[PDB]
Amino acid sequence: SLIAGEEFQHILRVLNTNVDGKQKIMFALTSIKGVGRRFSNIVCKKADIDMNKRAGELSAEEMDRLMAVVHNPRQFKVPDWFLNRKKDYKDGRFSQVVSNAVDMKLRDDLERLKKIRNHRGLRHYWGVRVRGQHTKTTGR
Amino acid sequence: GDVKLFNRWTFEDVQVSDISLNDYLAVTSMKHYTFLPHSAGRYSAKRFRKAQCPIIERLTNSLMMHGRNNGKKIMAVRIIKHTMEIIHLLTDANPIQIIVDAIINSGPREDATRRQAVDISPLRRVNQAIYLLTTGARESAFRNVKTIAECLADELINAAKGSSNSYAIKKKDEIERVAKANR
Amino acid sequence: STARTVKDVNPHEFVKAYSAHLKRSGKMELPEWVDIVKTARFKELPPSDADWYYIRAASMARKIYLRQGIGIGGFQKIYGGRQRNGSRPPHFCKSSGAVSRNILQELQKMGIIDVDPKGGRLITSQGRRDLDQVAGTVPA
Amino acid sequence: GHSNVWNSHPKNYGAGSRVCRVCGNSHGLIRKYGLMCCRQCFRSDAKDIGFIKYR
Amino acid sequence: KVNNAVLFDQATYDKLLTEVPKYKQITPSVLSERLRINGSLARRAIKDLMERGLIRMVSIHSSQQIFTRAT
Amino acid sequence: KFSYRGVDLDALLDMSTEDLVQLFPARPRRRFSRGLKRKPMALVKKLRKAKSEAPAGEKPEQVRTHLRNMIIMPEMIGSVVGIYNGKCFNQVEIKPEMIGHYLAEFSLSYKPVKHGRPG
Amino acid sequence: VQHRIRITLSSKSVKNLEKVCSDLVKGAKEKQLKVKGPVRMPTKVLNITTRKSPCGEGTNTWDRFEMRVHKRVIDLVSSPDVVKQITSITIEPGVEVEVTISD
RNA sequence: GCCGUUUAGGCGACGGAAGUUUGAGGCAAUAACAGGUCUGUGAUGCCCUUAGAUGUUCUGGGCCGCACGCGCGCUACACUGAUGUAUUCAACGAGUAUAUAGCCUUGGCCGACAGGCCCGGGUAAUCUUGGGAAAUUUCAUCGUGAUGGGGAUAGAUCAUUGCAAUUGUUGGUCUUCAACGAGGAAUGCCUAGUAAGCGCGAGUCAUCAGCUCGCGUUGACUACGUCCCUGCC
Numbered sequence A: 001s002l003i004a005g006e007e008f009q010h011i012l013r014v015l016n017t018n019v020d021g022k023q024k025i026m027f028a029l030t031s032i033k034g035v036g037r038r039f040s041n042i043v044c045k046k047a048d049i050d051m052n053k054r055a056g057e058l059s060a061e062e063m064d065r066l067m068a069v070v071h072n073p074r075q076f077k078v079p080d081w082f083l084n085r086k087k088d089y090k091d092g093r094f095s096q097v098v099s100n101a102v103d104m105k106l107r108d109d110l111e112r113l114k115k116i117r118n119h120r121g122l123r124h125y126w127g128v129r130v131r132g133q134h135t136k137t138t139g140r
Numbered sequence B: 001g002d003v004k005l006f007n008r009w010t011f012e013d014v015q016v017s018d019i020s021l022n023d024y025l026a027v028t029s030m031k032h033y034t035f036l037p038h039s040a041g042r043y044s045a046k047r048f049r050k051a052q053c054p055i056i057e058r059l060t061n062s063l064m065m066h067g068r069n070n071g072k073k074i075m076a077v078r079i080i081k082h083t084m085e086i087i088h089l090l091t092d093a094n095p096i097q098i099i100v101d102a103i104i105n106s107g108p109r110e111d112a113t114r115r116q117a118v119d120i121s122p123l124r125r126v127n128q129a130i131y132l133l134t135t136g137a138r139e140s141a142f143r144n145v146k147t148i149a150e151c152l153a154d155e156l157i158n159a160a161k162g163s164s165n166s167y168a169i170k171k172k173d174e175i176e177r178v179a180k181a182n183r
Numbered sequence C: 001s002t003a004r005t006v007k008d009v010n011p012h013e014f015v016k017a018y019s020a021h022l023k024r025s026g027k028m029e030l031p032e033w034v035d036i037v038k039t040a041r042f043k044e045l046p047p048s049d050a051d052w053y054y055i056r057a058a059s060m061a062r063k064i065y066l067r068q069g070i071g072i073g074g075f076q077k078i079y080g081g082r083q084r085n086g087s088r089p090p091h092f093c094k095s096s097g098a099v100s101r102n103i104l105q106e107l108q109k110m111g112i113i114d115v116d117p118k119g120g121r122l123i124t125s126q127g128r129r130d131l132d133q134v135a136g137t138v139p140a
Numbered sequence D: 001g002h003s004n005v006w007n008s009h010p011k012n013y014g015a016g017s018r019v020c021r022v023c024g025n026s027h028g029l030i031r032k033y034g035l036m037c038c039r040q041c042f043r044s045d046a047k048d049i050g051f052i053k054y055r
Numbered sequence E: 001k002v003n004n005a006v007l008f009d010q011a012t013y014d015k016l017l018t019e020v021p022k023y024k025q026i027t028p029s030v031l032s033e034r035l036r037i038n039g040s041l042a043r044r045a046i047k048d049l050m051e052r053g054l055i056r057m058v059s060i061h062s063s064q065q066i067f068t069r070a071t
Numbered sequence F: 001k002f003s004y005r006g007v008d009l010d011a012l013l014d015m016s017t018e019d020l021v022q023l024f025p026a027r028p029r030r031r032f033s034r035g036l037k038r039k040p041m042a043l044v045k046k047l048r049k050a051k052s053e054a055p056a057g058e059k060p061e062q063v064r065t066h067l068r069n070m071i072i073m074p075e076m077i078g079s080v081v082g083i084y085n086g087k088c089f090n091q092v093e094i095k096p097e098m099i100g101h102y103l104a105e106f107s108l109s110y111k112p113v114k115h116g117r118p119g
Numbered sequence G: 001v002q003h004r005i006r007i008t009l010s011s012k013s014v015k016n017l018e019k020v021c022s023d024l025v026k027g028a029k030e031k032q033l034k035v036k037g038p039v040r041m042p043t044k045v046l047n048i049t050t051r052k053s054p055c056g057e058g059t060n061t062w063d064r065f066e067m068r069v070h071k072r073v074i075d076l077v078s079s080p081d082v083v084k085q086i087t088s089i090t091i092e093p094g095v096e097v098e099v100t101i102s103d
Numbered sequence H: 001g002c003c004g005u006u007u008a009g010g011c012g013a014c015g016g017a018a019g020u021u022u023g024a025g026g027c028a029a030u031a032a033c034a035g036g037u038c039u040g041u042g043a044u045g046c047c048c049u050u051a052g053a054u055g056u057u058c059u060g061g062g063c064c065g066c067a068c069g070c071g072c073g074c075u076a077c078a079c080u081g082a083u084g085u086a087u088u089c090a091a092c093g094a095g096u097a098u099a100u101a102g103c104c105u106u107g108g109c110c111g112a113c114a115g116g117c118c119c120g121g122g123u124a125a126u127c128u129u130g131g132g133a134a135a136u137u138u139c140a141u142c143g144u145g146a147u148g149g150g151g152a153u154a155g156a157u158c159a160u161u162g163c164a165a166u167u168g169u170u171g172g173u174c175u176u177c178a179a180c181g182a183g184g185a186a187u188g189c190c191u192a193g194u195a196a197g198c199g200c201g202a203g204u205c206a207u208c209a210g211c212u213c214g215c216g217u218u219g220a221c222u223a224c225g226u227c228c229c230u231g232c233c
């Protein structure tokens, strides 16, 4: 089929994450934390990127448009029900949290509950289950 | 030549070499010629009725394993068709003859019960041949890019020649050997 | 040859021919949420075929041709399937009603299918003619 | 006001609202067909109610 | 640990266009095992060789695609 | 500077109740939409007395209650409530980060298990 | 005569219901009234399955109780007078006769 | 027909819907067990308690608590597959007080979903429901990579049931993406429409089915024996 390209990159340094060039671009974007298969699919469609390509096949500009979509799903018309941070506590702004910011938001959301002595925050602090599951026989 | 397997393969020119294994492979008699390896037959009410069941169907039924493939006989028939086409491609012969040769060159003839070495009956011989053939094909296909139809074709082709590159023939050899060591 | 109606042709080929017919006709207006939505909630990815809207339009057009009175809930049941519930047993689930309603309204804005007083949707004479005249072009 | 705090919890639903019509126990209650009998009481009166065991 | 490639290099394209048409049975699995290529690349290479007319088709199916040589 | 959806604490205090529902999560929104019962309002009517009759910039006198399923409002950021956990009233000074949560989430109804003998 | 009469018969027993139906269709055929019936509806099988043990000990054994409701429909064309004159014979216990006048 | 004392019966064969008392149940002796149940019973003897109650009711909590051990299960470990199209076959059963409306819900509209709104049908072979079940089938993608296998855990958020959802009722959306690559010693069930796979219905039920009791769909392997083990006689 398609033979190759001299520009084919095996590892592409993307959003402080390594993306395999031997992977289809849609599933290749799921390497960055905060981006799943469905959000990567939406990002690929809205950036006008061929879904039958491989990550290494794309050029610099194509990944730049992918990052334009990933860092601002809203300007590219990605609805607000499609975001992993809907209606933020402090901000109130809808946004798509990606990369290390996901871990940062996790830690801040847990610290908020660990200062107000909320039950769920204390469950997090004790290393036990937080979503009301039985702990007698499972989770060992 | 009115009845052909898949309406693509003739029954008349199938030679079942072994006289011992002749009444327990249902290929030669015109009563055992079928268009499809699918009959929904009641070949289990009596002790020796599965012998009068077409041999391609007996090969097909052993593909419905394991539990994740249980009851999926249309997919098994599809595997049989795609295997019989690869056999015809790689041997240029009638796939039914390759299959009967593989089932003949795979059934162990002697075994060790209790450790006295005993001889296998023709029915258990064909049962063991089919079980080893499909087991080897399935284990070849597991976690492998190669399709179950291609693995079945390769296993059947290597068992028809008699080569020790077929899991069934290697295993037949071990079985009969332990009945030579423990004679 | 010709003189073949819908119940004479292989459905897999008829749907493919009629989706192309609908896309050529240019009388279908696509929603904004064509590249976003999933056909059902048990689905985990949007349809992988760009012309899935026209394919589903042809499918429902053929279904209304063969049966009269199908409603939006009926079409949700028709295109619903098995939902995998993670560690829980699978069950049946229904499809999206917005997609079915929008496509059926688009097919009312072509005079292919109307709505019957008895409930649901009927095939129009023009729609019957269109499907039957496309069925004759389907190679046997 | 004691009458507004006596039986003041709603009995719209719940197992502690439906009782056996033969004994008033609230456990193992068969609500099917409007029987409203408990399992034990239905097993005893089933013949009178008209349920016959064939299989 | 499979190291199947996803895109041909020019030498492997030459071998695909010359040695592969000499294969008796041509299916995506055989090409993947021999040429050390991905199954997607195998299927697409089979389609291209069916476009250049260097192979025939004995049977096509969703699970198993069986192709053979015209020569 | 506590915010709760980009607003400020003073604005939140002054903000109308019908907007404050729309800043609250879906569970509090449904709770207010279905209408609060007389015990919930009565508790806030007692807490506002506790805040007003408070002598000076000291904490309002503890107001004990059995109300664990109560949505914490921005009106109650100065209150000192004691929620019954089944056995005793635990005193909590309500803080603004607690807005929208239930009072039950701030009064443990069990004891954190520290395991002993294998038995 | 003039109107259209649907007599619905239900019962828990087949023999009583069938002999009542035979009486009705025999009376209808003696007074020269055309009768469409008896028409046997699908039998309703009311089923209750419960643990036979009054407690939770032993092999969990289940008794399956069944009540079978048999429905019969008779369709005459006549006036109400002959209908209540026919459905006035001794209807056996358990049989629920129900007369409804149609157009 | 053969075997069988040529009996009682067995095997094979034709015919036959059926030849395995046709299949599967229900019922089911004598005598027992200090078997379970006083937490089914306005069945109960005796004992305890009985107004500051072991009665009753209301509020709140618990029955869910988690270093760990065991049992029944569900989901998997993948290509005989996952995903996304196309496509089209069941059966058992269940369903309302009409009050604006209660149960099963059709149809139309809004909504990405979740759900909501609006006209109605059905006390039912009449309406929901010809029950528009899945596995399966078809095409395409993936390509042996814990990988598009797996989906545990977790964050944010939106809806619904309810008087009330926190110790997440549940259902959605986006995100997070653990063990697990077939399981040691052991041990369970099963001989034909059976095992296994697949889904549906009912009971429980305001809401909650990974459970039970039924149902159908797809549909095998192996044996037609023995007392080796286990138990019973």
Ligand SMILES: [K+]
Pocket (backbone or CB within 6 Å): H037, H038
């Ligand atoms: K008792």
Ligand SMILES: [K+]
Pocket (backbone or CB within 6 Å): H038
């Ligand atoms: K007692």
Ligand SMILES: [K+]
Pocket (backbone or CB within 6 Å): D025, D026, D027, D028, D029, D038, D039, D040, H040
């Ligand atoms: K009871």
Ligand SMILES: [Mg+2]
Pocket (backbone or CB within 6 Å): B140, B141, B142, B143, B144, B145, B146, B147, B148, H079
């Ligand atoms: Mg394989």
Ligand SMILES: [Mg+2]
Pocket (backbone or CB within 6 Å): C073
């Ligand atoms: Mg509706």
Ligand SMILES: [Mg+2]
Pocket (backbone or CB within 6 Å): none
């Ligand atoms: Mg499953």
Ligand SMILES: [Mg+2]
Pocket (backbone or CB within 6 Å): none
């Ligand atoms: Mg005892």
Ligand SMILES: [Mg+2]
Pocket (backbone or CB within 6 Å): none
């Ligand atoms: Mg418990």
Ligand SMILES: [Mg+2]
Pocket (backbone or CB within 6 Å): none
């Ligand atoms: Mg599929």
Ligand SMILES: [Mg+2]
Pocket (backbone or CB within 6 Å): H146, H147
């Ligand atoms: Mg993974």
Ligand SMILES: [Mg+2]
Pocket (backbone or CB within 6 Å): none
């Ligand atoms: Mg998955």
Ligand SMILES: [Mg+2]
Pocket (backbone or CB within 6 Å): H208
């Ligand atoms: Mg519960």
Ligand SMILES: [Mg+2]
Pocket (backbone or CB within 6 Å): none
């Ligand atoms: Mg239920």
Ligand SMILES: [Mg+2]
Pocket (backbone or CB within 6 Å): none
């Ligand atoms: Mg045992």
Ligand SMILES: [Zn+2]
Pocket (backbone or CB within 6 Å): D020, D022, D023, D024, D025, D037, D038, D039, D040, D041, D042, H040, H041
């Ligand atoms: Zn009772």
